[PDB]
Design a protein around this ligand. Structure first.
Ligand SMILES: [Cu+2]
Ligand SMILES: [Cu+2]
Ligand SMILES: [Cu+2]
Ligand SMILES: [Cu+2]
Lengths: 168, 168, 168, 168
């Protein structure tokens, strides 16, 4: 029943919970990369600054999702945040590639939550996602594919250094 | 056959009219409560200030729909504005409670109008509704449910006066 | 071997990892409380703001710990972040009591990491903990016990409201 | 028997003297490298600027110890300052590498002096060392190991010149 509940189906509420946890996994994985470039044997501190921002950015998307969950009458059920697969992510190009599939995975999750809110006619929730998440995911997915092509252009060695200084 | 008509079904035109009339009823009902907390034997000026705001909200929310009705080529068919059910709304709780079901009633009327734009392929009218009405309704519906909870906590007496001073 | 390693024992490195994960659990639990007071049926938004800060504050202690782990030659091994015990923490007094045992638990963990660095004569690590963590824990433990005594003084109802407005 | 002597064992006094002499050797060695990157056939002015800084760091680090030796009632027994092993330090890498082991050598000499304050119950002299020397040494030792990694990445040639311009 709750108090502000209207047009908010039970499947949608459990999807926001399932999505809240994945957005936290993204924040975790990005922090794992942050401190892979603060590692002294890599020492790319502007790459590290990138993932520190991106980790905080995703933690703010989870918060924006939980803040929405409370605004619609649902209740927040948190689950364990699983550790990232790797603890050492290789070259910058390799790590940026990992990020692409990550945000590409996080995107399709959002795209399927939108499909659920459509199933039970949740027009507002559809707008909230397509305005505050889908619009941002396509931005992040391009800017990551932008960094992928450049890191391939500059190559290794001096290329990995000069891309940290000038672009990041 | 009006100059700017495109993709605008007469069913959607009629819905905006019936919806304009309802958004005005909410202005009247909130104004009824405005001048209730200014009663000499109610004397809650900040609750009065809250409904003076909210009454002007709905009035400008109806003006936006009217401005949209002309923007799409429909014609504004006005109707009578019914007097509110009550002439006195009891405790601040029982007033806020009447407000919740009011916005909750208006939210469905907006949602059903959104279903009418979807029935006739009006992609624009969908975004206008879910962007400048449904988005606001969800926030307000929470905001009211936040006041109901706190009023139940502070209880009758000094708790009612304090909520007026510190929150409103 | 690594590159900057000196006087940094294997037990200490695994303790920083084990402590990094617990500091994240603290950040998680605090966020769970943050959104328990953004819940519309509780709606204490200055209590919620407290745990939003405290959750971010602990996430910055983990970062300060990982930043230290990289500065001393150790490597960061992350583990799963377990979900908080409860998803609804009861009255404010009850939640603040939970927090006390939390920071009291997180303290003794730090106190025992200090004992490990002492075992293998890690004078710097001892200073880093007793300057940047132990000094802050005793501050946080008092300010939480301060909030515990007051919430007992003001009681329930109007007391729980007026403490959110004036002090938080 | 000096005026401000308390808790200050002659073993600690002797250690500060031998440590003062070493902190000056690091000033000389860094100055040796300063005027090496100003050689007409090295011509790396930013690497020169780095060692002009670091040479003045150790000189002021010895002055702090001297100021502390007088602060505790000990007397400053100066000794000769040995010339550095080399008169030319090769590539920027092989120079930075010589610097790592230099600070790593100085860090142990500080740590062993800290063990001398602990052997004779000098709680203050412990905090002065671990507060204004050991804390800095850990940071510098990382900072050097960060430069070694990046120089190995950028490689000889244009990579050496670019690191001079963009990082130093
Ligand atoms: Cu995201
Ligand atoms: Cu409205
Ligand atoms: Cu902490
Ligand atoms: Cu020094």
């Amino acid at each position: 029943q709750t108090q502000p509940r209207q047009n908010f189906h039970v499947e949608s509420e459990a999807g926001i919970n399932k999505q809240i946890n994945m957005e936290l996994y993204a924040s975790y994985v990005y922090q794992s990369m942050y401190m892979y470039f603060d590692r002294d044997d890599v020492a790319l501190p502007s790459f590290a600054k990138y993932f520190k921002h991106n980790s905080e950015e995703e933690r703010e998307h989870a918060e924006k999702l939980m803040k929405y969950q409370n605004k619609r009458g649902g209740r927040i059920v948190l689950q364990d945040i699983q550790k990232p697969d790797l603890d050492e992510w290789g070259s910058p190009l390799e790590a940026m590639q990992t990020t692409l599939a990550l945000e590409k995975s996080v995107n399709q999750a959002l795209l399927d939550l939108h499909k659920i809110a459509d199933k039970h006619g949740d027009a507002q929730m559809m707008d909230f996602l397509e305005g505050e998440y889908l619009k941002e995911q396509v931005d992040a997915i391009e800017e990551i594919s932008d960094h992928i092509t450049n890191l391939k252009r500059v190559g290794t060695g001096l290329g990995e250094y000069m891309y940290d200084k000038e672009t990041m």
